[PDB]
Amino acid sequence: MRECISIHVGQAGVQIGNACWELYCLEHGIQPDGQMPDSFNTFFSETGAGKHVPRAVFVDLEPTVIDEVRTGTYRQLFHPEQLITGKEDAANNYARGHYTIGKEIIDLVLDRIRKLADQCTGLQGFLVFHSFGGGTGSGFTSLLMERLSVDYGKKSKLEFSIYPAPQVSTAVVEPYNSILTTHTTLEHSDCAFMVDNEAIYDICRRNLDIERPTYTNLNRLISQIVSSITASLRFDGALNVDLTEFQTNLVPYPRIHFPLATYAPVISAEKAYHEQLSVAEITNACFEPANQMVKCDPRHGKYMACCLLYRGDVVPKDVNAAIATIKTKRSIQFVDWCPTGFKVGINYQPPTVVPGGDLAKVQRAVCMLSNTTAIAEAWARLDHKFDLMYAKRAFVHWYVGEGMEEGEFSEAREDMAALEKDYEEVGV
Amino acid sequence: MREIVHIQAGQCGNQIGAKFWEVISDEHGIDPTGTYHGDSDLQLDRISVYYNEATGGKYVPRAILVDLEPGTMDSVRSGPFGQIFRPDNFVFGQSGAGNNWAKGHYTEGAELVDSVLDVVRKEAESCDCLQGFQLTHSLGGGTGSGMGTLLISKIREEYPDRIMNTFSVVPSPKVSDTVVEPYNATLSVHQLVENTDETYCIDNEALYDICFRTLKLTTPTYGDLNHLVSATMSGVTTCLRFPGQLNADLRKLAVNMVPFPRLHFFMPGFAPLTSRGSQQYRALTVPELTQQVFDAKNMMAACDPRHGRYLTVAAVFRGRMSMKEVDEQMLNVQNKNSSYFVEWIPNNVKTAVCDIPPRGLKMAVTFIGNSTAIQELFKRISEQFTAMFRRKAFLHWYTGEGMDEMEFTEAESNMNDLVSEYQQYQDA
Amino acid sequence: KEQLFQSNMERKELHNTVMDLRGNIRVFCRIRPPLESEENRMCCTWTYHDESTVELQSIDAQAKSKMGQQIFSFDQVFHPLSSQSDIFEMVSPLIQSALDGYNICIFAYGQTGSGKTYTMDGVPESVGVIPRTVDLLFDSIRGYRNLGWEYEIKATFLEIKNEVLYDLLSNEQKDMEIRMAKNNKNDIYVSNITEETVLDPNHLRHLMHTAKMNRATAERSSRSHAVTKLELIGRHAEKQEISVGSINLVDLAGSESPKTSTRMTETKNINRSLSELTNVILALLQKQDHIPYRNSKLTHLLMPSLGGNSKTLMFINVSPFQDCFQESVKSLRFAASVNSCKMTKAKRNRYLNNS
Amino acid sequence: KEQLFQSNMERKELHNTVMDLRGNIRVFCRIRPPLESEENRMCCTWTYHDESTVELQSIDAQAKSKMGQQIFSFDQVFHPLSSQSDIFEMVSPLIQSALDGYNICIFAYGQTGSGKTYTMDGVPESVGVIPRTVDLLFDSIRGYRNLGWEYEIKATFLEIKNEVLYDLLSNEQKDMEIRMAKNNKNDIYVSNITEETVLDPNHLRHLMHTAKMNRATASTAGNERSSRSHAVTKLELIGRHAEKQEISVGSINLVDLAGSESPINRSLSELTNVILALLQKQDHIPYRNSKLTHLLMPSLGGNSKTLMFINVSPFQDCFQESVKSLRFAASVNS
Ligand SMILES: Nc1nc2c(ncn2[C@@H]2O[C@H](COP(=O)(O)OP(=O)(O)OP(=O)(O)O)[C@@H](O)[C@H]2O)c(=O)[nH]1
Ligand SMILES: Nc1nc2c(ncn2[C@@H]2O[C@H](COP(=O)(O)OP(=O)(O)O)[C@@H](O)[C@H]2O)c(=O)[nH]1
Ligand SMILES: Nc1ncnc2c1ncn2[C@@H]1O[C@H](COP(=O)(O)OP(=O)(O)O)[C@@H](O)[C@H]1O
Ligand SMILES: Nc1ncnc2c1ncn2[C@@H]1O[C@H](COP(=O)(O)OP(=O)(O)O)[C@@H](O)[C@H]1O
Ligand code: ALF
Ligand SMILES: [Mg+2]
Ligand SMILES: [Mg+2]
């Protein structure tokens, strides 16, 4: 059994995982208590009794999010021991969650994930859900992810860090958190799927067409994204691409591992009636210049490779025809080294939606994953923001007073700068 | 559970704290007796961070009431929600500092701060985890200002990690009720900025005009001023004590509002400021609420933002609102108030939506800005100080209490230093 | 050859002058003899382009693909074969300037095992800067008794740790505050400090020895700040003048990043010191109108030593090893940055007692 | 031999570095001992505050208490017991720097009868700055010969009285103008001047004697011509190394300033203003406002070294001008 586990940390990630597991239970027909009136073997750990506990440990320095899932219907699904709490969060400080608080907390989660790995027949990887600007999403996760590489590393850790919103930085110190976490993630990051909240807002305005969508609505979009992403493992399909193949398919370079997610059927129910939900139309939708989950210009970005998690009533034959036209599209640009990265994880399992789910339920779906150099500009602006703040040493006192060092800040800066050079070098 | 302990100093501090705990009890449905009669069990979710349960639903407010004249506390006994305190907490003196900071710091104030520290620390280990100290007092009188500084020194040395969210009423620019307040406030803020990390500027005439004109009040009784500051004070921590989509705490804002150690004074605020019956002439909504929260008319001190720049802002938005509309609103204010905005630090905002709104009020926010507009306030205070210092105007009261003009000169120098920092970073 | 020796010796004297005369901040990069165990574990490469310029090549695996020539030019670069006298001959003219009536401050910057105590304390083996400068100062004092100047020495020992000021001379827990003097706004003193009048070098040795046991009793030594203030007053009865000078021996803590083997609060205080120092020195390089001297106790205590009438030294104790190569080169970057820094003009203290 | 003078070259170079680091413009005060014809002259109360400061007091108690403090600090103070070697001890580093490609200015300042002339010219019994400088210069050139450096001395003698330049080496009166040098816009030259080439100290001694004779000194004979004129003697050093090039061009400008006592002051006041502006690091220096400052413009730059002597008469009747000279000197130390 190709069983895999997921971990959740920070305000962003615990709710993300909750919505993700909502769809997982929806397609596994499992109740919040954990009974299914198979496909959950990889995720929901069916015990001796009728209890399918999904492999998901939710650990945050702030216990409020653990309390929210405890009050959440999936209180039974989310094993209470898997729900690791804390006292103070990590502020907006990677150093706080990397050298003072999360530094000892990771060990407790290490026991949780390693015991889950013992129960697991064949661990595939780690679905870490978090943000970049988040203090716990930065230091705690970066130390947790790097410790996972120390513990195993062989497992295809599928990093899922929410890209920090550029237009509005929820944290004024988001740049530091983002660059510092990548400084301690890029080296151990097997394949980091990237999603920006602002891009989801734009999708909820151009496709979902929701005037007032809460974060739960963003999590619902991510829920469908990860449902299609792991659909290959949970459900058989024409071509099942797992986390191991995801790494080979998405990341072609040891440092170049930041593909942006993309869901074709993110249109509203009315838009679903407006469209014919054609395989070709949704292929174009998942390759539209404004479906990238990160604030980047895909047309100007060379795509290392695109992984389409096609699912539902779709055949690779129609996908090949549709993607062939997209390959000819001049707007779609791939790196000269790999200009034919059109590998598609075609599956024959129709995507379900949570009752009341914002995303329209479509008979077919495709989770396009494009590792493009367009995100180099996004990494550049993140580095630039950190540079101007670090230039006059702003908020550095907090980090250094939490185990950070100005030398490490400079290392993070050159690491990100070198990553941009790697991106453009892959493009040309 | 990251509890917080409350300190009261001076009659202003005691009265504002009284109304503050009344407001909190309203929030958590706490009877004046101490027994819980609210309906939302979520009121008991973090009730421990303020109300330590004693016995049978009787929750002791975690309050320390300190003064050198018994009259205020006697009123507290007579006043409702006074008997709700455990009477052991009312640790007070008899003579009175007499609006003399030196008296409040070496005379009766010394003995009482010495006498209460034991009680407050006992309450401290009575709690599980601690965050900080609110020295709810004022700089108007020598007592609360002095003993508070004596206490803050003891509080800081014994609990340096704790972040002291002390609230103070800055001496009015026009209403100099205390003739020696230039000397007093200055002596206080010397030691404060030496130790503290977050103060506030509240002007009696500022709230006077606010209630007169924005609120349409005719009798600005101190009750209104106490209620206004108490409401803002509650909103500061509602993110901590209550769940929300994006939860913050004292630590978040503590590490977010201070680019530098010393530069740690802030201007608070709240919204909306609807009048007695203005419900018709506008329609209550979060756009208009944001619109009228960031204007100088909705400030808190006489510090006009028309002479300073918002270095950082920490808007909380207690309730349920739209992350988008706040994003575009901060965008718009950044565009229009870029002049009154630190260009050196971009992307400065701390949206921290907290789900539960205030009582009977659907929508609310508490503005907290580190605007570089205090330097004029410190300038006028330093001017008053030096004007009363050229002739040592009524210096005999202080010098006679075993004190020297040495510290007066040093405090004036440090206040000049704060002015220098504010102007230097506002310009640069 | 005799004329050749005179010429080269005169030029060597000019070398000593220019360094301090121009300065005004003498950043010194001294490379200690690499420890054999740490050598065979892992070591980096260094080449001295001249006596004052060092290039810490490394360029092995990560420095190979990420960085180039680590050539950094300074005031003086010391070989691992350099002796205590070799680093001390350049301190002697500055000690002469201090006894002339100038304030002098000394910093020892480095990580754990760098050799900061071997510079200042001198280490049990041989002697260090402190005993050598004591002997030199006493010799110059008797020389100026032959010149008619009577000098008194005041010694104050202070230790800075976890933001709490500790008196190295007394074990009693006392509340320390640092404050500018009433006579002048520039000079700053510390209240309730154990002040003693030095009578002879023997008593000074005894008190230094006791203070060093108190320091060791208080791995805190590698991570705690030691401040020594030696105040000298020179009375000339015939001239009716008083010459006032101060010597500030400061032992900095390890500048290493937290990594794993570190505690929270001590690391936070070290970050206070290093970050506030970096910010204020950068502002000085920036020619900023205001320099925030009152963010940390360190810069406030040495406000005269950093922004007043004083001449201050940088000693960059660097371990020439690849494991610490990144921290070492960061130290060299900061040392070059402060080499570019400027000190407020020092002022010789002359006070005529005619009135 | 070669290594000896190579070390000497490095040594003298860093010596000029120390000199520039000092800031040059060094001010010194010299006091002349009373003569046999001035034993019946009222002196001043000279109490010596060390060898770097001196203050003067009037004997008149009615006036002593009415002037307050008269303390003035210097880099070095010369007493009447100081011999000419003591004054020359601080000229030799400047001459060595001049040999290195730097411009040196030697100035003597004070009232008539202070001793400026014998500070610069001196007597046959005790030579002044000029003979010691030329002897040391020729010895240095003889030393430089061993490393291949070929030094040629070009001496020019000129006098400035009323902002008009006069040549002291020829009686053929001409019109001489101050003009910017052809190969250097910062360097200066004066046209029609007799630029003789010095071969030995005897030749320059003869040239100085001829210049003095043609000067027609009247400092004491009517107090008309010599007492109100500037005696500017320029020594130029042009050293050329074979197979090394890298020529060193330096000049020595020893100027005997005219009397500073109250009555031309047109050049003296401009020189004072130029020196004060140089001490203040002023962006614009009024070099062209006078002939004397314009002539010495290339020799008053940042790299150039300026030397100042303040000679004062220790007499009561000279007190009112001695205090003015000491105040002018104190405009430098503060
Ligand atoms: N999609 C989505 N984004 C969220 C959610 N909650 C927070 N975020 C995003 O997370 C960022 C804010 O950081 P937080 O997630 O609060 O930080 P954290 O990971 O909890 O770590 P701390 O800063 O230590 O509290 C912003 O980009 C938010 O938009 C959520 O439920 N869904
Ligand atoms: N906002 C507010 N300010 C008050 C109130 N009562 C007093 N003040 C102000 O605070 C000052 C009292 O300072 P405090 O330290 O309490 O006085 P003391 O105890 O007599 O030394 C007064 O002079 C007023 O300026 C009140 O109820 N509300
Ligand atoms: N020149 C030297 N000769 C011999 N040993 C040295 C030298 N310099 C440093 N060391 C060694 O380095 C070690 C560091 O000691 P110390 O200076 O007390 O700690 P730190 O270097 O961290 O301040 C000492 O044990 C000492 O033996
Ligand atoms: N150091 C000295 N020793 C002896 N006599 C001196 C000294 N200095 C000046 N005099 C005398 O002062 C007289 C005036 O000459 P001097 O003052 O040098 O001319 P000037 O007024 O041009 O400077 C001379 O006759 C000389 O004898
Ligand atoms: F090891 Al140390 F000062 F760094 F004693
Ligand atoms: Mg040590
Ligand atoms: Mg003459």
Considering the four listed CATH numbers 3.90.1150.10, 3.40.50.1440, 3.30.830.10, 3.20.20.10, the one that applies to the domain covering A1-259 is 3.40.50.1440
User: With a 6 A CB cut-off, is D80 part of the ligand 4 pocket?
Assistant: no
Domain at A260-374, CATH homologous superfamily: Tubulin/FtsZ, C-terminal domain (3.30.1330.20)
* Helix and strand element counts for chain A (H, E): 17, 10
Strand partners, C353: none
Backbone angles phi, psi at C27, to 5 degrees: -80, 120
Best probe residue, ligand 5, of C221, C227, C251, C317 (max atoms within 8 Å of C-beta): C221
Backbone angles phi, psi at B78, to 5 degrees: -65, -35
Domain at A375-428, CATH homologous superfamily: Helix hairpin bin (1.10.287.600)
Contact A32, A76 (CB under 8 A): yes
Contact A144, A17 (CB under 8 A): no
Does residue C258 belong to any structural domain of this protein?
yes
For residue D183, the tally of other CB atoms under 10 A from its CB is 6
Please check whether residue C82 touches A, CB under 8 A: no
Measure the CA–CA gap between A353 and A360, rounded to whole angstroms: 7
Strand stretches in chain D, DSSP E? 26-31, 45-47, 53-57, 71-73, 76-78, 103-109, 149-160, 165-167, 178-180, 188-190, 196-198, 230-241, 245-256, 305-312
Contact C194, C159 (CB under 8 A): no
Measure the CA–CA gap between D39 and B268, rounded to whole angstroms: 86
Is A245 labeled as catalytic in the residue annotation?
yes
Contact B230, B23 (CB under 8 A): yes
Helix (H) or strand (E) holding B130: strand B130-136
3-state secondary structure of C216: helix
Angle, helix A406-427 to helix C264-286, in steps of 10 degrees: 70
Measure the CA–CA gap between C217 and C214, rounded to whole angstroms: 5
Q: Which chains touch D (3 or more CB pairs under 8 A)?
A: C
The type of residue at A185 is T
Contacts of residue B398, defined as CB under 8 A and 6 or more positions apart, other chains included, come to B100, B101, B102, B180, B183
Rg of the Cα trace of chain D? 20
User: With a 6 A CB cut-off, is C33 part of the ligand 3 pocket?
Assistant: yes
- For B357, counting Cβ atoms within 10 Å of its Cβ (0-12 exposed, 13-18 middle, 19+ buried), the class is middle
For residue A414, the tally of other CB atoms under 10 A from its CB is 13
CA of D158 to the centre of ligand 3 (A): 68
H helix runs in A240-297, sequence order:
243-250, 269-274, 279-285
Angle, helix B10-28 to helix B222-241, in steps of 10 degrees: 50
Before B272, cis peptide (omega within 30)? yes
Measure the CA–CA gap between A232 and A246, rounded to whole angstroms: 11
Q: Specify the residue for token string 């270095």.
A: B311
Please check whether residue A88 touches C, CB under 8 A: no
Contacts of residue B6, defined as CB under 8 A and 6 or more positions apart, other chains included, come to B17, B21, B50, B61, B62, B63, B64, B134, B136
Please check whether residue B346 touches A, CB under 8 A: yes
Please state how this structure was obtained: cryo-EM
For residue C179, the tally of other CB atoms under 10 A from its CB is 14
Contact A381, A53 (CB under 8 A): no
For residue A46, the tally of other CB atoms under 10 A from its CB is 17
Best probe residue, ligand 4, of D30, D31, D32 (max atoms within 8 Å of C-beta): D32
3-state secondary structure of B359: coil
For residue B348, give the chain A residue with the closest CA: A172
Before C24, cis peptide (omega within 30)? yes
Which candidate, D305, D323, D307, places its Cα nearest to that of D76?
Answer: D307
Of C1, C7, C17, the CB nearest to D18: C17
Measure the CA–CA gap between D20 and D100, rounded to whole angstroms: 13
Q: Do A397 and C275 touch (CB under 8 A)?
A: yes
Measure the CA–CA gap between A190 and A180, rounded to whole angstroms: 17
C130-134: Cβ within 8 A, 24+ apart:
C130/C208, C130/C228, C130/C249, C131/C205, C132/C84, C132/C85, C132/C88, C132/C91, C133/C88, C133/C91, C133/C92, C133/C95, C133/C247, C134/C201, C134/C204, C134/C205
The type of residue at A176 is Y
CA of C261 to the centre of ligand 5 (A): 14
3-state helix, strand, coil in chain C (%, to 5): 40, 25, 35
Angle value at C-alpha B344, between B339 and B350, nearest 5 degrees: 85
Contact B355, B247 (CB under 8 A): no
Q: Specify the residue for token string 């006069």.
A: D166
Of C163, C180, C290, the CB nearest to B421: C290
Domain housing C214: 2-344
Give the CA-trace dihedral at A339, A340, A346, A350, to 10 degrees: 40
Which candidate, C221, C195, C211, C263, places its Cα nearest to that of C108?
Answer: C221
Does residue C331 belong to any structural domain of this protein?
yes
Contact A249, A269 (CB under 8 A): no
Does residue C352 belong to any structural domain of this protein?
no
Which candidate, A73, A78, A76, places its Cα nearest to that of A14?
Answer: A78
Which candidate, C73, C106, C109, places its Cα nearest to that of C336?
Answer: C73
User: With a 6 A CB cut-off, is C30 part of the ligand 3 pocket?
Assistant: no
**Starting from the edge strand earliest in sequence, which strands make up the sheet with A56-58, in order?**
A56-58, A5-8, A126-131, A158-163, A191-196, A260-263, A364-372, A303-312
Measure the CA–CA gap between A38 and A25, rounded to whole angstroms: 12
Contact C93, C17 (CB under 8 A): yes
**Domain end point (choices B243, B259, B275):** B259
Measure the CA–CA gap between A291 and A207, rounded to whole angstroms: 9
Q: Are residues B144 and B225 in the same domain?
A: yes
For residue C265, the tally of other CB atoms under 10 A from its CB is 15
We report the CATH number of the domain holding residue B393 as 1.10.287.600
Residue with the nearest Cα to atom 12 of ligand 1?
A134
Contact A14, A65 (CB under 8 A): yes
Contact B181, B140 (CB under 8 A): yes
Measure the CA–CA gap between C119 and C127, rounded to whole angstroms: 9
Chains C and D touch (3+ CB pairs under 8 A): yes
Measure the CA–CA gap between C169 and C158, rounded to whole angstroms: 8
Helix (H) or strand (E) holding C28: strand C26-31
Angle, helix C201-217 to helix C129-145, in steps of 10 degrees: 160
We report the CATH number of the domain holding residue C189 as 3.40.850.10
User: With a 6 A CB cut-off, is B5 part of the ligand 2 pocket?
Assistant: no
Contact D259, D227 (CB under 8 A): yes
For residue C353, the tally of other CB atoms under 10 A from its CB is 11
Measure the CA–CA gap between C105 and B116, rounded to whole angstroms: 43
3-state secondary structure of B290: helix
Residues with their C more than 2.5 Å from the N of the next written residue in chain D, i.e. before a break, are 263
B60's tokens: 């002791």
Measure the CA–CA gap between C190 and C193, rounded to whole angstroms: 6
Measure the CA–CA gap between B423 and B195, rounded to whole angstroms: 22
Q: How many residues does chain A have?
A: 428
Contact C217, C166 (CB under 8 A): no
Q: How many residues does chain B have?
A: 428
Q: Are residues B247 and B135 in the same domain?
A: yes
Strand stretches in B183-278, DSSP E? 199-200, 265-266
Taking CB atoms and an 8 Å cutoff, what residues of chain B touch A68?
243
Q: How many domains does chain C have?
A: 1
3-state secondary structure of B143: helix
Helix (H) or strand (E) holding C315: strand C310-318
Contact C127, C84 (CB under 8 A): yes
> Of A245, A275, A377, A411, which residue is the catalytic one?
A245
Would the annotation count B204 as a binding residue?
yes
Measure the CA–CA gap between B344 and A393, rounded to whole angstroms: 12
DSSP 8-state class, residue B41:
G
Please check whether residue A107 touches C, CB under 8 A: no
Contacts of residue C169, defined as CB under 8 A and 6 or more positions apart, other chains included, come to C157, C194, C196, C207, C210, C211, C214
Q: Which atom of ligand 1 is nearest to the CA of A165?
A: 27
Contact A424, A376 (CB under 8 A): yes
H helix runs in chain C, sequence order:
2-22, 36-41, 62-66, 84-88, 92-99, 116-119, 129-145, 201-217, 264-286, 297-301, 303-307, 325-339
Measure the CA–CA gap between C254 and C274, rounded to whole angstroms: 10
B354: region left, alpha or beta (phi > 0 left; psi from -120 to 50 alpha): beta
Which candidate, B66, B55, B63, places its Cα nearest to that of B25?
Answer: B63
How many angstroms separate the first and last alpha carbons of chain D? Answer: 45
3-state helix, strand, coil in chain A (%, to 5): 45, 15, 40
Rg of the Cα trace of chain A? 20
Q: How far is CA A260 from CA A306, A337, B38, in A?
A: 10, 19, 47
Does residue C349 belong to any structural domain of this protein?
no
Q: How far is CA A385 from CA A93, B260, B344, in A?
A: 16, 18, 11
CA atoms within 13 A on the CB side of C109: 26
b/e sequence B209-219, b meaning 16+ C-beta within 10 Å: ebbeebbebee
b/e sequence C275-300, b meaning 16+ C-beta within 10 Å: bbbbbbbbbbeeebebbbbbbbbbbb
Measure the CA–CA gap between C98 and C101, rounded to whole angstroms: 5
Alpha carbon of D207: minimum distance to chain C alpha carbons (Å)? 34
We report the CATH number of the domain holding residue B164 as 3.40.50.1440
Angle, helix C92-99 to helix C2-22, in steps of 10 degrees: 60
b/e sequence D102-134, b meaning 16+ C-beta within 10 Å: bbbbbbbbbbbbbbbbbbbbbeeeebbbbbbbb
3-state secondary structure of C253: strand
Measure the CA–CA gap between D254 and D155, rounded to whole angstroms: 11
Helix (H) or strand (E) holding D7: helix D2-22
Q: How far is CA A30 from CA A35, A44, A46, C193, in A?
A: 5, 9, 10, 72
Q: Do A408 and C272 touch (CB under 8 A)?
A: no
Strand partners, B271: B365
CA atoms within 13 A on the CB side of A360: 22
Rg of the Cα trace of chain B? 21
Would the annotation count B143 as a binding residue?
yes
Q: What number of C-beta contacts closer than 8 Å exist between C and D?
A: 36
Strand partners, D127: D122
Contact B253, B350 (CB under 8 A): yes
Of the listed ligands, the closest to the CA of C128 is 3
Determine how β-strand C177-180 pairs with β-strand A260-263.
unpaired
Measure the CA–CA gap between D83 and D85, rounded to whole angstroms: 5
Helix (H) or strand (E) holding C228: strand C225-236
Does residue C355 belong to any structural domain of this protein?
no
Chains A and D touch (3+ CB pairs under 8 A): no
Measure the CA–CA gap between B169 and C7, rounded to whole angstroms: 72
DSSP-derived secondary structure for D17-71? HHHHHHTS-EEEEEEPPP-TT-TTS-B-EEE--SSSEEEEE-S-HHHHTTS---E
3-state secondary structure of A127: strand
Contact B1, B49 (CB under 8 A): yes
Helix (H) or strand (E) holding C230: strand C225-236
DSSP 8-state class, residue D200:
S
Which candidate, D92, D111, D89, places its Cα nearest to that of D258?
Answer: D111
Going from N- to C-terminal start, the domains of chain A cover 1-259, 260-374, 375-428
Domain housing B417: 374-428
Does residue C63 belong to any structural domain of this protein?
yes
Contact D322, D41 (CB under 8 A): no
Contact D116, D110 (CB under 8 A): yes
3-state helix, strand, coil in chain D (%, to 5): 35, 25, 40
Contact B316, B248 (CB under 8 A): yes
- For B359, counting Cβ atoms within 10 Å of its Cβ (0-12 exposed, 13-18 middle, 19+ buried), the class is exposed
For residue D5, the tally of other CB atoms under 10 A from its CB is 20
Residue with the nearest Cα to atom 5 of ligand 5?
C222
Q: Which chains touch C (3 or more CB pairs under 8 A)?
A: A, B, D
Q: Which chains touch A (3 or more CB pairs under 8 A)?
A: B, C
Measure the CA–CA gap between C169 and C159, rounded to whole angstroms: 10
Backbone angles phi, psi at C259, to 5 degrees: 50, -125
**Domain end point (choices B259, B289, B313):** B259
Contacts of residue D181, defined as CB under 8 A and 6 or more positions apart, other chains included, come to D187, D188, D189, D298
For residue D143, the tally of other CB atoms under 10 A from its CB is 16
Contact B90, B48 (CB under 8 A): no
B6's tokens: 């409350």
For residue B363, the tally of other CB atoms under 10 A from its CB is 19
User: With a 6 A CB cut-off, is D114 part of the ligand 4 pocket?
Assistant: yes
CA atoms within 13 A on the CB side of A134: 29
Q: Are residues B210 and B320 in the same domain?
A: no
Give the CA-trace dihedral at A102, A107, A112, A118, to 10 degrees: 140
